[PDB]
Structure formats: structure tokens, C-alpha cells
Design a protein around this ligand. Structure first.
Ligand SMILES: [Mg+2]
Ligand SMILES: [Mg+2]
Lengths: 148, 118
RNA sequence: AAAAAUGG
RNA sequence: GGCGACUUUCUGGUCUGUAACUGACGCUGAUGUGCGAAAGCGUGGGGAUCAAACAGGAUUAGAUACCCUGGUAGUCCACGCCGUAAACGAUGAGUGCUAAGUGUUAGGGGGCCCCUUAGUGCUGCAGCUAACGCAUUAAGCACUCCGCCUGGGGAGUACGACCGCAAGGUUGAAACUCAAAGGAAUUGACGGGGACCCGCACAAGCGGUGGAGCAUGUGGUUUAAUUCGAAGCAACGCGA
RNA sequence: GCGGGGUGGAGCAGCCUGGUAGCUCGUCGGGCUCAUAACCCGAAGGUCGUCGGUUCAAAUCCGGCCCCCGCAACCA
RNA sequence: CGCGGGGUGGAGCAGCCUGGUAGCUCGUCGGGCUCAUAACCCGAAGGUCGUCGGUUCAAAUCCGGCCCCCGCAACCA
């Protein structure tokens, strides 16, 4: 019961970094429309990761998203079995940012800027909660690899 | 404690419940065998072509370790994994001299079991 | 191609 | 009823063409007398497979089933018995007459074609039929003989008789009870039928309710009264 | 006469070895359903047959009263 | 009495042979799954290996003492 696919929205680049991914991360972090709170939180987290890593904030964030972006997922089809299926590039970015923020919000730090900075650092090191989520997704996709 | 042969026969039996592969000499002596059940697959997965491909690859690796180079394919059963087994045998490096399906076509002899009502 | 009864 | 590897022996029936031969010797067929799928029974043999019963394993609320693993009788053979099937084309046999088109099997006659006999299919007039349909293989038009029916249930039961080793078979009521049972076709509705489509229906997401304090409506209970109405979705911040 | 037993509504553990009452079904409340059943979540329910004793403490160990079960009740 | 074997998450089995590492099947918790339910897939927690000693850089593993269970065998105060 659906005529087709709808056009997708296009966000503007980050004002300072000029990165659509940064803009989309700001949108993910934003709650109740508090765009300013989202922006300040993200910039503080970027500054903290820059300070703690001595490497470009954009470079480390790109590494983190590359680490926490999945390639395969398990989508049920039917007599009914979950089948591994490649993930679209936009689903990759969506899932990477979504998992990043979701598992940042669960960290034990006091402030969201600290939580996000630590999470992006751990993801860049390939040892974060979002990384664990991606690993579980990939292994279960492999487990169901036969049904592909 | 080593067997060295150049030509041989790979027997692949593919039934809707499992796939079995073995390699023997031209006079039918077994060296190693591989089945989806041994590989690990259970239930539905044992019928999938992937399990057949894995079993054929394992069996072919053992056969070439013993030193097999050329092999003739002997196919039995209507299962779906026969083609995957053939392709795995080819890709393992063994040379497929010829393929033949030796599934036993019964003449009018014995009465088959009852048709299932499920 | 799992199982899913009944209703003055 | 049934009959499917091949070979040999014995043996039944059917069709085609001549018109030597008999010259109505025919049709039907109560009672009789025989054959008759499968299961089953008796004696003896055989026994792979399959598989009632049975035993486990599953499923399930239960599962004395469906599914899985086994498995005895039986399935096979000889000789007896049984004599029943949706033993069906749900259509007795014989005979003649009544448009056509087209396939196929076994023949025959005339020039790849035409005609013809006997079957076996499909389509289709007249006619028939409640309709569905039948339609030279009639369910049409006619004549002969036979069998059979007379609302549903009780009941193919009871009694009696005959038959059978048995299982049972054949024949076969009544009391009583109902105003219905039925056939075909039609329009809906429905289906753990099909096809094609829609909807925040699902999927992909985001945010809630259900836990706490409070506001409010409702139920219940209390009260002299706790005014009446609203009750699944489509009553309960609803009349207000 | 001798043994064994009596524990939420039912059936059955726990006793041997004192400090701890368990399981299945049933009941009640909420949920699911158009409704019932099934099902899911949560809860209540036994002074351990009844009297005495030992013990700091008794379902538990010991002795009576009651009830049930089983076995025995033989020789003339 | 002699000879063997066994004791490992809540249950049932490996790993001991030959020193490192605690694995496998059920069970509980969370997630995917579905109209639920089951089945199935993925994440966790779960014994420090019967107990006390001994040799080693290192012990479930090797060597002793001890506590139980099983098999066979022995037993003329
Ligand atoms: Mg009704
Ligand atoms: Mg109910």
C-alpha cells in the first residue's frame, strides 16, 4: 500500500567544519528542537577529543564513524527467516550516528560533551559500545550468511 | 602413512536434508569425507547451497593435501547443493574431468512410502 | 511446509 | 471385475471384405447358474519393500491423530471360502430413424485427396431437460422385454428364512416421530482460496501511556441525597 | 497385634540430619478476546491431625488421643 | 584389605593423556523474531575444577595426605 519512494532531505554543511555528517550528528543529538544546545554540546565534544588525542577532530570522528558503520544487516523475509542483506550508504551513516549517540548517552561520564567525546574516542580506537553493536550485527549476519 | 594419487573420483550425495562429499581412488577407497552435519550446519541450513559448497571445499582441500589433481564428479540425489559442490570442487584447484549423475532411477520394483499429509 | 478450540 | 518386461505352449472374443451355404434358427429374461476390486477368513509355503494393530519420539490445553523412528498381520504364491465397493458414464438390453465440424485406433474401396465399416474423443443443430446439460457413443424420435421408485427419519434396523468357518451377505417391516427432507440454479456473505490495489495497516523511525504526586471523568461503595443521561471500536477532560 | 501415614482448596515434597514450609493444579487481580477457553504478568492462601514433653528454638526429636492405609489374626 | 575409575557454573558432559588458556548441551537474564506462542539467531551473568599440602616462571592438568561414590577381587580371633 505505497505508491513509491519519497525525496530525501539534504542538510547544510557544518558552519565551521563544513561536514554534512557533522550537521546530521547535530540533528541526532538535538532534543525538543534545542539546536543551540546540540551545537554547543557537539563542539565542546570535538574540542575535548582534539585536546585528548592531538589529532584533527574531523579525522578522528571520520575514523570513528567508519569503525561503527555496518555493512550487513539481518532483515526478515518469507517459511520466515532472517536473511543477511547489504546496507545502503545512507543507512550506514544513519546507523553510525544513531548508535554513536545512543551509546554515548549511556556512558558514565557526567556531561553529554564528555560522554560524546569519550564515545567517539573509543569508536576511533575500535573498542566502543557502538563498535560492539556493529560487531554483533556483523556476526549474526555471518551466522545467517547461508540464507543469503 | 601418506597416499599419493593423481586421478580420483569425488562422490557428492545431495539430499533435501544434508549434503555429503567424499574423494576416493578410481577403485573406490575413501581418503576423507565432509558433510554439512560435520561442518556444523543444523536443520534448514544443511540443505542450503552454501553448506554444500563448504563441504566440497573441505573435502577437496583434504584430497589435494593427499595429492589429488584430476577428479571425476559422481552426483547422487536431487538436492539443491550439487551445483555449488561442483563449483567449489572447480575453485579448489582440482580439475573436473567429467560430471555424471548416478542417481539410482528405480524401475517399477519397490513400493515407495506413504505420501505425507503435512 | 509448526499449533491456534468454542459461541441457545 | 480388470489386463502393461520378454520367450514358448494351450485357449476365448471382436472388427473388415466377398455373398458359397442354413433360411427367422431372433430380442429380452423372473426363477436358476457362474464370474466378480480391495479388505477379510482356512490350510500350507514365502517374506524384500510397504504397512492396519502396536511401541517409542514430537505437536497440542489434551492428541488414543495428522508429522518422525521402528513394526506384526497383511501385501506375494497354491488351493478353498467370502460375494461386497462412489463394482460409476451415479445412464439395463435389443432394434430402427433424426444437421454438421474435427482428432485418433483397426481395416476396406476409388483417384496427397475422396468415399466407407467398426470403435474411441472433442465441438455443435433440431429435439429433450427443473436447470445443469445430453445431442448418430442421446439424456432426441419410436417399439419389445427386464430390473427398480413412490416424503424425511426410524432403517438397510428388528423378527423370520436362506447362505457363510467367521466377519458378515441376501431378503426385509412396523410402532413412533417431523412438515419438511431433496435437485439445479441465483444474489449476497464468508474462507486458516486466488489476483490486483489502498490506509501510520506493516516495515524504517521519533515520542508517549501502563510505575510516582496532583487535576479530571467513570465504575464501585458510603450517604438523607451523593440529580439524570452516555457503555467495545463509535461511553469514561463525554451533555458540562 | 505390628508397622506406615495425617503439611494452603486437591495431589505430592520437605522429617532421616531442629534454626530454611517447596512443586503441579486450583483460587483472586490485571492483561489478550466481540465473549469464553487457552495463554501472559502479579498476588493471597497451611498456627504442619490434636494434646503433653525435651530444647534457647519443634513439620522435624519423644510420649498419649483421634483418623486413614497395609500386613497379621494360626493348631485343634 | 588390593586394584582401577569418578568428584568441574543451577543440572548433564569435555579439557587431565602431553603444564599454561577453564570449553560443549541444557537452565536463567536481555535483544532480534512473530497477530501473538513455539522454534530459531545474537549478547550476558553464571564453577576457579571434592578438600589440605608438595615440585615448578606457570597446576583442573604433575606428586602426596585426606572425604565420599562405583566395578571386580580378597577376608578361619
Ligand atoms: Mg450459533
Ligand atoms: Mg477470558
Amino acid at each position: 500500500p505505497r505508491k513509491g519512494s519519497v525525496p530525501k532531505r539534504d542538510v547544510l554543511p557544518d558552519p565551521i567544519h563544513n561536514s554534512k555528517l557533522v550537521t546530521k550528528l547535530i540533528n541526532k543529538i538535538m532534543l525538543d528542537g534545542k539546536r543551540g544546545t546540540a551545537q554547543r554540546i557537539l563542539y565542546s565534544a570535538f574540542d575535548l577529543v582534539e585536546q585528548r588525542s592531538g589529532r584533527d577532530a574531523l579525522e578522528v570522528f571520520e575514523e570513528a564513524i567508519n569503525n561503527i558503520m555496518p555493512v550487513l544487516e539481518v532483515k526478515a523475509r518469507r517459511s520466515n527467516y532472517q536473511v543477511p542483506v547489504e546496507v545502503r550508504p545512507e543507512r550506514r551513516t544513519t546507523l553510525g550516528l544513531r548508535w554513536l549517540v545512543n551509546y554515548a548517552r549511556l556512558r558514565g561520564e557526567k556531561t553529554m560533551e564528555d560522554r560524546l567525546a569519550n564515545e567517539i574516542l573509543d569508536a576511533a580506537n575500535n573498542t566502543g559500545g557502538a563498535v560492539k553493536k556493529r560487531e554483533d550485527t556483523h556476526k549474526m549476519a555471518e551466522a545467517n550468511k547461508a540464507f543469503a | 602413512v601418506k597416499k599419493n594419487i593423481e586421478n580420483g573420483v569425488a562422490h557428492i550425495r545431495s539430499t533435501f536434508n544434508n549434503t555429503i562429499v567424499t574423494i576416493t581412488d578410481e577403485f573406490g577407497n575413501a581418503l576423507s569425507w565432509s558433510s554439512a552435519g560435520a561442518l556444523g550446519f543444523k536443520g534448514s541450513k544443511k540443505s542450503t547451497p552454501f553448506a554444500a559448497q563448504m563441504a566440497s571445499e573441505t573435502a577437496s582441500k583434504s584430497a589435494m593435501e593427499h595429492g589429488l589433481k584430476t577428479v571425476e564428479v559422481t552426483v547422487k540425489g536431487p538436492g539443491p547443493g550439487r551445483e555449488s559442490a561442483i563449483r567449489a570442487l572447480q575453485s579448489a584447484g582440482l580439475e573436473v574431468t567429467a560430471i555424471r549423475d548416478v542417481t539410482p532411477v528405480p524401475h517399477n520394483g519397490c513400493r515407495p512410502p506413504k505420501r505425507r499429509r503435512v
